[PDB]
Amino acid sequence: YANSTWEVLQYKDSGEPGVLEVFVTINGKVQNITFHIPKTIYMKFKSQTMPLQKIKNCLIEKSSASLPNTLPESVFLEEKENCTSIFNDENVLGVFEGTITPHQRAIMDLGASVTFRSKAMGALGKGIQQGFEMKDLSMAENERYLSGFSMDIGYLLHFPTSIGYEFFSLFKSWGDTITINASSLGQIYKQMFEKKKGKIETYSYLVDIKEDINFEFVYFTDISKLYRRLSQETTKLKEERGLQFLLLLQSPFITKLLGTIRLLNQMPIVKLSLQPTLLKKLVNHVLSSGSWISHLIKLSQYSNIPICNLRLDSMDYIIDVLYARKLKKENIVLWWNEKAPLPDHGGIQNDFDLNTSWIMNDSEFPKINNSGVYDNVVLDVGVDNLTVNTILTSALFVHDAFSNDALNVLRGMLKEWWDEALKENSTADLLVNSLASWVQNPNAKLFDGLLRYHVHNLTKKALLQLVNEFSALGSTIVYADRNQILIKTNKYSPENCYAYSQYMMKAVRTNPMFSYLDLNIKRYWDLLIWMDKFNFSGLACDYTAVSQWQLKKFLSPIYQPEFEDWMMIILDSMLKTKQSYLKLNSSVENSLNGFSHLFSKPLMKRVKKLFKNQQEFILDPQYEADYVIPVLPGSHLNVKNPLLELVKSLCHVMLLSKSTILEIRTLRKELLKIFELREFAKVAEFKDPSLSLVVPDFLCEYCFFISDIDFCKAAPESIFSCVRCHKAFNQVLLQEHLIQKLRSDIESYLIQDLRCSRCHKVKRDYMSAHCPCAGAWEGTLPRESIVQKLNVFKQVAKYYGFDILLSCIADLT
Amino acid sequence: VLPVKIQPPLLRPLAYRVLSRKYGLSIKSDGLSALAEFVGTNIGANWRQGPATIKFLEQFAAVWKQQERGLFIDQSGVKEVIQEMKEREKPESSKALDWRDYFKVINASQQQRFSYNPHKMQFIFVGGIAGFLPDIEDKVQMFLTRYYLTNDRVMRNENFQNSMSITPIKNLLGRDAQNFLLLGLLNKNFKGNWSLEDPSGSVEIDISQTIPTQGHYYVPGCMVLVEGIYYSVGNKFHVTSMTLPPGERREITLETIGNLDKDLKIRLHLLEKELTDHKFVILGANLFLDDLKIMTALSKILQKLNDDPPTLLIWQGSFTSVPVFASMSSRNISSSTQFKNNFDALATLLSRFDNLTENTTMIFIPGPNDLWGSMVSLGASGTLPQDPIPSAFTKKINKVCKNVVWSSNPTRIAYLSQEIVIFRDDLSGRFKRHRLEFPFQKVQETRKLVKTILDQGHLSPFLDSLRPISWDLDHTLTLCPIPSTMVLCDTTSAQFDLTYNGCKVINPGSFIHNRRARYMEYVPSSKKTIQEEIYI
Ligand SMILES: [Zn+2]
Ligand SMILES: [Zn+2]
C-alpha cells in the first residue's frame, strides 16, 4: 500500500458505505485491502446555523458557491435515517444540493490512484484488521510511474451470437490454451503477427505470447459447458496464479460476470466491452489484445485513474474524473448524479421547469443558405474543432446562463490538454476530441443541460462571427452549417485562386477568436448551381462535374434521365457562356446573360415532342410503369402532369440565377404555353417536392463527427453511415433519436405559450376567454404544423421500415 | 329447446303486429332475419315467443330508447340483457353472474369528456393519425373547467355549512375597504408577487399577516378561499385567512350527476356480497428490474403469491433503474432494447409459476423512468397523463399471461359500484418543495397531503409550468366524483393508509424501504388493507 495504486476499486460494499476492495499494487505483489470512506455532503449552511450535530460536525456555509438554476456533514452511514434532519428552515436540508457520489467514486475524485499510507508499522498493522480510512490514511501521491512493469493477464474474450456458434474462449499468458481447421488461419494471421509482436515487444514491453497456440474445438451445447465449464476453468486459473493476474474480460453483457465469474475473478478486472469468416475475428482480437494494454497503461499514467475504468467511451469517464478533480480544487459543488442522466441539482432537477425544458429540447442549428448560380470561384471550406476552439476562445442576473466559474475551469482544463497535445501528447488530443463529443452526452457523470446550451450558443455566435469575418474579407457566404462553410471568392479567374485562398485562411487564423480553428479547403468550384446542400451541381477541381440533384428522385422514372441529361446541357451552356464572356473581356449582370439562347429552341422542341408522346401514351396501359410518381419519404405533392413537373424543375433550377431572371422567365412562359398554362398559374409554381426531418447534432460513435442527419432529403447511403468516415450507424440508435425528436415535438406543442391573434401579446393569465384587445388566443406552434410533422414521421417509418417508430406512431393513437 | 330455422317472411306478420303497433318500433329486413334466427334457435315451431318479443321491446324502450330495432347491435344488446336478468332471477342461459362482465379498467385515453356548462350543467362531449392532438381552446378552458368544478363544490358545501358569498375578483375594483371572500387560483404574477386568478380577473394579494389553515398544503396553482379587505390605494387584497375549499362526499356528487339502471345496481350490489373473498395486491413503487437484489426479492414475492393468487396484481412505475433516452453507443446499452431485455427477464421469472398468472388480471402502471415518457423528461416529472407502456416492449410478458392490462399512470378501476384510482407520483416531494412560506408528525404530513389532494379535487393541483398536462386529458385527473379507493403511490412519503371524506387512500411506498420488499394487500369487500413486509 506504500505508493501503491489500486488496480480495481470494485464496490465491495457489503452494506457498508465506505468498505470496498482495494487491490493496491504493493512492492512485492498486489494484495486485497479494505478502505473506509465517509459520505461527504455539500449542504452549505445558508443563513441558518444548525447546532444539531447528529454524528459529524457541519461546516458553516461550506465557504463555497452553489449551482444557479472542505467536507460539511461528513456522515458515514446515511442509512441511519432516510428522513435525516428534514427541517426546511432556510436551507437546512430544505434543498439537498449535496453530492450523490457513492463509494468507488469519491475516492478517485479526491484521492490519487497512487497512494501511500503515511503511518508507521504499528498504525499499519492496526489498520490491517479493519481497513484504511481515508480520513487519517491514504494521502494522494505522485504518479510519475503509476502503472507496473510485468503483469500477468487472464484474457477471457467472449463474443456470443444468435446464429449458433459459441465463442467462450479463454487465453493465458504462458498456458496458451485457447479453448473454444483454425490452425491454418491462425498461422496466416501469425504471418504478420511476428511484426505485430515485434511492435508489442518494442512499444508495449509488458507481456509475451507463446508460439504454440493450440485450438480446442469444444461445443458448448448447454449451460453445463457454457457456464459451469467456464467457471471451473477460471477457478483453476485463479488457483494457478493466486491473485496474480489481470483479467482482460470482453463480453457484450456483463451479467455473465456478476453471475459467478465476477466473484470468481475478484482480482484486477477490466471490462473491454467491445462462420469461417467469423473465425478470423477471434484470432485478430486475441492477437491485437497485446496492443491496447500499452494504451491503457499510458491512459492510467496520464489520467489519475485506476485500471477499473470502463472502455466504453473511456474518454467520457476520464473527462468526468478530471473535471471533478479540477472542480474540487476550486470551491464549487458537484452535480455528479451517477444514477440518472440529469444533473445533481439537489431535488429541483426532478420536476418540470419551462426554461430548463426549453434549453434541453433545443438543438436546431441555424443555417445560412443562399441559392443561385455562382460563376465566381467558390471554396468548399470545411471547418473543424469549432466546439474546442469556441470554449478555448470564449474568454476573449441571467438565470438561463451556466456558471461562469465552472466554464472558466473548463476553459483552463481544455487549454492545458490543448497545449499538451500541441507538444507531443497522445492522451491530450484524445481527451480534447472526447470533450468535444461528451458535453452533449447525457450518460456523462457531470453532464449539465445548462452547460450544453451555453456551449451551443457560443458555437452559434462563433460561427456567425466567422461568417462576418469572411464577408469582411471580400467573399459572400452561400452555406454554413458548423461543419463546412462555402465562400464566394470574387476572383473570377480559377487560376487566381490558390494565393487568394491561402491569404484568406491566414487572415482568418490571425484573429485570436479563430486561432485554434483549423480550416482546410476541400473542393474548388469553377461553376456552381446551388439550391440546397442536397440540390447542387457545377464544375469542381474546373474539370470534374457533379450532378447531385435530389429533385430528380421526385420525377417519373421516364423523365429522370431527361432531367439528368438536361442538367448537364444547362451546365455546359453556362460554362460556354462564361468562357465566351471571359474571352471577350480579357448580381445585376454577370458573365451569364444569354446561356438560355444556346439550348432554348432544342428544349422547346424536345418538350413539344415529349408532350405529344405523353398525350399518346398517358392513358394507354403498358406505359403506366413509366408515368408513375415515385413515393419518397418527403413526398407531399400530388402530381397530375409529370412532364409539367419536369419542366417546372428545369425552369426553377434555371431561375436560380439572379442575373438571368428575365430571359429564363420568357423561356418558362414559352414552355408553359405548350401546356396551355398561364405564366403565373398556381399549378405552374414550383414547390419543393420534399419535406425535411432533421435529427440535430447526431454523433458518430467512431470518428466523433457531429452532423445533422436529414431523413426526408438525404440519400439512404448518407444516413446509415457517417460522412467523414464510412462506418455504419445502428438502426436502434436512429429509431431512438427519431422517437426522441417526436416526443420533443409533442411536448413542445403541449407546453407552448398562447398569444393573441391580433396584437401578438403573449398570454400571461390562466383563465381568460380572449386577449383584452378583443383578440382570440392562438398558439405559437399551430396544430397543423405538428400534424404535418407526425405525417412526415409516419412516412419515414413506413418507407425505411422503422419498426419501433411505427410502434410509436400506432401507440400515439 | 328443439332447434329450428324459421324464415323471416312467416315471422314478419306477428313481429310487426307487436313491435310496431303495440309500442312503435320499426323493424328492418336484416333485423327481422336476426330475430327470426334467435327465435328459431331458442324455441321451436315459433308459436309461444310473444312474451319473448314483449320483453325484448320493453327492455329496448326502457334502456336504448330509439327506433329501427334491427341494427344487429340493439337486438343483440337487448337479448344479452334479457340473459343477465334471467340469470339473476335464478331459455338461452341460466348460469351465474360473472364479475368479468362488470369488471373493467379505464385508461386515461378512454374516459368520457365531461365539460361543465358554467351556469348549471355537466355536459357530455365524447379521426386520423394526429387525432389525439388537443386543440388550443382545450388549453384555454383547461383551468376554467377546473375552476367551475371547484366553484360548484364550494356553492354546495360552504354556504350550506359556513353564509358569506363568493364575489368574483372583477367586483373588487370600485370598492374601497369592504370585506370579500374570494375563490381564486393562487399563482405568482410575472412581476413576481403572489396573486389570485379568477375567470373574472385577477388581483394581487398581500400575504403578510395571514393566518392559514395548518391542515393543508398551499402551493401555487392550488385554488384557495381567501378572505380580506380590498384596498384601492394600490389595488391589493389584504388577505387575513386563506383556506382550501371544503371537500365533498362521493355519494353527494352521484345524485347531482345522476349516473348509475336499477337492474345493474341490484346486480352489482348482489355480487358485492357474493364476491366477499377477492384480494387486490398492490406492489411497491420503483420495481427496478435492473437491480439483481430487487429481482431476487420479486421472485420470493411471486412465489408467495403463487400459493394464493389474488384478483389483481398491480405493478408500479419506474421499472428500470436509469431513465431511458437515446444513447449514442455501440454496445448493448441501447436503452430501448435493454428495456426489452429487462421485460424478457421478467417473463422468465414470471412464467415459471403456473398457478400464478392465471385468473389474475395484471395491471401495469408506468413511472418517471419508463419508455415514451422518459425520452424527453429524462426521468423528471414530465407530462402527467402518461401513456401506457408501449406494446412493442411487452411481447413476452403479454404472451406468458392471458389477462394483462397496460394502463395510464392516473388509471381508473371499475371493479364494482365503487371506483378505484391508481396514481404513481412523488406528490410529497413536490408539495414540500413548492409550498409557500407564511410570514404570519409523519402521519400529520400524510394527512396534510391527502387533505390537500381531496379538498383540491384534482390529482395534481399544480400550475402548467410545474406539471404539464395534456389539455384534453385533464378530466382524467379531476376528482369530481371523489373515488372511494385511491392508490396514491409515492416514493418520498412514508407508507400509510388513511380514510377521509369517504375515500380510502393507500400508499404502498417504495418497494425497498431499508431491506424489505414491502407490498400492500387490499380487500374491497371488507374495505380493509394490510401490508406484507418480506425480508430480503
Ligand atoms: Zn463517422
Ligand atoms: Zn391582443
UniProtKB/Swiss-Prot annotation, chain A:
Motif interval(s): CysB motif: 756-773
Highest taxon in the source lineage = Eukaryota
Q: Where is the signal peptide?
A: none
Zinc finger residue ranges, CysA-type: 700-725
- Which parts of the sequence bind [4Fe-4S] cluster? 756, 759, 771, 773
Residues binding Zn(2+), per UniProt: 700, 703, 722, 725
Q: Which family does it belong to?
A: Belongs to the DNA polymerase type-B family.
Tell me more from the record: In eukaryotes there are five DNA polymerases: alpha, beta, gamma, delta, and epsilon which are responsible for different reactions of DNA synthesis.
Q: How does it assemble?
A: DNA polymerase epsilon is a heterotetramer consisting of POL2, DPB2, DPB3 and DPB4.
* UniProt domain comment: The DNA polymerase activity domain resides in the N-terminal half of the protein, while the C-terminus is necessary for complexing subunits B and C. The CysA-type zinc finger is required for PCNA-binding.
User: What is this protein's function?
Assistant: Catalytic component of the DNA polymerase epsilon complex which participates in chromosomal DNA replication. Required during synthesis of the leading DNA strands at the replication fork, binds at/or near replication origins and moves along DNA with the replication fork. Has 3'-5' proofreading exonuclease activity that corrects errors arising during DNA replication.
Q: What is this protein called?
A: DNA polymerase epsilon catalytic subunit A
Native organism: Saccharomyces cerevisiae (strain ATCC 204508 / S288c)
Report the gene name. Answer: POL2
In terms of the whole protein, what range is present? 1317 to 2221 of 2222
From Swiss-Prot, chain B:
| PTM comment text | Phosphorylated in a cell cycle dependent manner during late G1 phase. Phosphorylation may facilitate the interaction with POL2 or the activity of DNA polymerase II. Phosphorylation is independent of DNA replication but dependent upon CDC28 in vivo.
Residue positions where Phosphoserine is found in the record: 460
UniProt xrefs under InterPro entries: DNA_pol_a/d/e_bsu, POLE2
Q: Where in the cell is it found?
A: Cytoplasm; Nucleus
Instruction: Name the keywords, alphabetized.
Output: Cell cycle, Cytoplasm, DNA replication, DNA-binding, Nucleus, Phosphoprotein
Please indicate if the UniProt record lists Nucleus as a keyword.
yes
- Return the GO cellular component terms, semicolon-separated: cytoplasm; epsilon DNA polymerase complex; nuclear replication fork; nucleus
Pfam families documented for this protein: DNA_pol_E_B
Q: What is its main location?
A: cytoplasm
GO MF terms held by the record: DNA binding
Extract one GO BP annotation from the record: DNA-templated DNA replication maintenance of fidelity
Keyword Phosphoprotein, does the record have it?
A: yes
What this protein is reported to do is described as:
As accessory component of the DNA polymerase epsilon complex participates in chromosomal DNA replication. It is required during synthesis of the leading and lagging DNA strands at the replication fork and binds at/or near replication origins and moves along DNA with the replication fork. It has 3'-5' proofreading exonuclease activity that correct errors arising during DNA replication. It is also involved in DNA synthesis during DNA repair.
Give the record's subunit note.
Answer: DNA polymerase epsilon is a heterotetramer consisting of POL2, DPB2, DPB3 and DPB4.
Family that this chain belongs to? Belongs to the DNA polymerase epsilon subunit B family.
More about this protein: Present with 3110 +/- 251 molecules/cell in log phase SD medium. In eukaryotes there are five DNA polymerases: alpha, beta, gamma, delta, and epsilon which are responsible for different reactions of DNA synthesis.
- Protein name, entry field: DNA polymerase epsilon subunit B
Show the taxonomic lineage. Eukaryota, Fungi, Dikarya, Ascomycota, Saccharomycotina
